[PDB]
Amino acid sequence: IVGGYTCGANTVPYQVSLNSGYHFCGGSLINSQWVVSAAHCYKSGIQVRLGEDNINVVEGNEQFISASKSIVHPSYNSNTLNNDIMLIKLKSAASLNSRVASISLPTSCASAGTQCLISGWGNTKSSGTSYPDVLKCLKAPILSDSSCKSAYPGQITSNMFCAGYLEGGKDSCQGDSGGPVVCSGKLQGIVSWGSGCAQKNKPGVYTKVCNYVSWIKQTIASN
Ligand SMILES: O=c1cc(C(F)(F)F)c2c([nH]1)CCC2
Numbered sequence: 001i002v003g004g005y006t007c008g009a010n011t012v013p014y015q016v017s018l019n020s021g022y023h024f025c026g027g028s029l030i031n032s033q034w035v036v037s038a039a040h041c042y043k044s045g046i047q048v049r050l051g052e053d054n055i056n057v058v059e060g061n062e063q064f065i066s067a068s069k070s071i072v073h074p075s076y077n078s079n080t081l082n083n084d085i086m087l088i089k090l091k092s093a094a095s096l097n098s099r100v101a102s103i104s105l106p107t108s109c110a111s112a113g114t115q116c117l118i119s120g121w122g123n124t125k126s127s128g129t130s131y132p133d134v135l136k137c138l139k140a141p142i143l144s145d146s147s148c149k150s151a152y153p154g155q156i157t158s159n160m161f162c163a164g165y166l167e168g169g170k171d172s173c174q175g176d177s178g179g180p181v182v183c184s185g186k187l188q189g190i191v192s193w194g195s196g197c198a199q200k201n202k203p204g205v206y207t208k209v210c211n212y213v214s215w216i217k218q219t220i221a222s223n
Pocket residue numbers: 122171172173174175176177178191192193194195196197198203204205
C-alpha cells in the first residue's frame with residue numbers, strides 16, 4: 001500500500017497473509033473454513049496466516065493453518081486477469097473472535113463514489129521498494145466505469161473496477177495482491193492489478209466480487 005496508514009494491530013480481522021516460506025499475497029476470511037484471494041496468487045504449499053499484524057514477529061493472536069484445497073475460478077485468464085479470483089479451504093476451521101473474523105459477501109454491487117478500505121503488506125513505495133512488517137490501510141473510493149476504462153483502454157472487463165485516486169499518490173502495490181477491498185462492511189473487491197503503483201491516471205484495478213457470490217456460495221456448499 002502506497003500512501004496509506006498503519007491500520008493498527010488486528011483492526012482488519014478478516015485480512016489474511018498467504019505464506020509459502022514468506023508472505024506473498026493477501027486474502028480475506030469469508031467463513032471459518034474459507035479464504036477468498038486472487039487467482040494470480042495461486043501456488044501449491046500455502047499456509048494461511050490469520051490474526052497477523054507484524055508478519056515477522058509472533059505477537060500472540062495468530063492462527064497458522066495450511067490450505068487443504070485451492071480452487072481457481074474456472075474462467076480465470078492469466079493474460080487478461082479476467083476472473084481473478086480463487087478460493088482456499090483451510091485444513092481446520094479458524095477460531096473466530098474479535099481479532100479473527102469473517103467478512104460478509106456483498107448482496108449487491110457497490111457504486112462509483114463508495115468509500116472502501118484496502119489493506120495489505122505490499123510495497124509502500126511508488127518508486128523503489130520497501131516492504132512493511134505491519135498491516136497498512138488505505139481509504140479509497142470506487143471510480144466510475146468510464147474513468148476506469150479511460151485509464152486503461154482495452155483492459156477493463158465487466159469483472160473489474162478501479163478504486164483510488166487519479167491524481168496518484170495513494171494505491172495498492174506489489175504484495176497487496178489478493179487482499180480485500182471492503183465497503184460498508186462487505187467484501188466488494190480483491191486486489192488484482194495495476195500499472196506501477198500510485199501513478200497519475202493509473203489507479204488500482206480490483207476483481208468485482210459481487211459477480212462471483214453465486215459461484216462462491218455453491219463452491220463452498222459442495223467442497
Ligand atoms: O505492479 C502492480 C501489482 C499490483 C498487484 F500485484 F496486484 F498487487 C498492483 C499494482 N501494481 C497497483 C495496484 C495493485
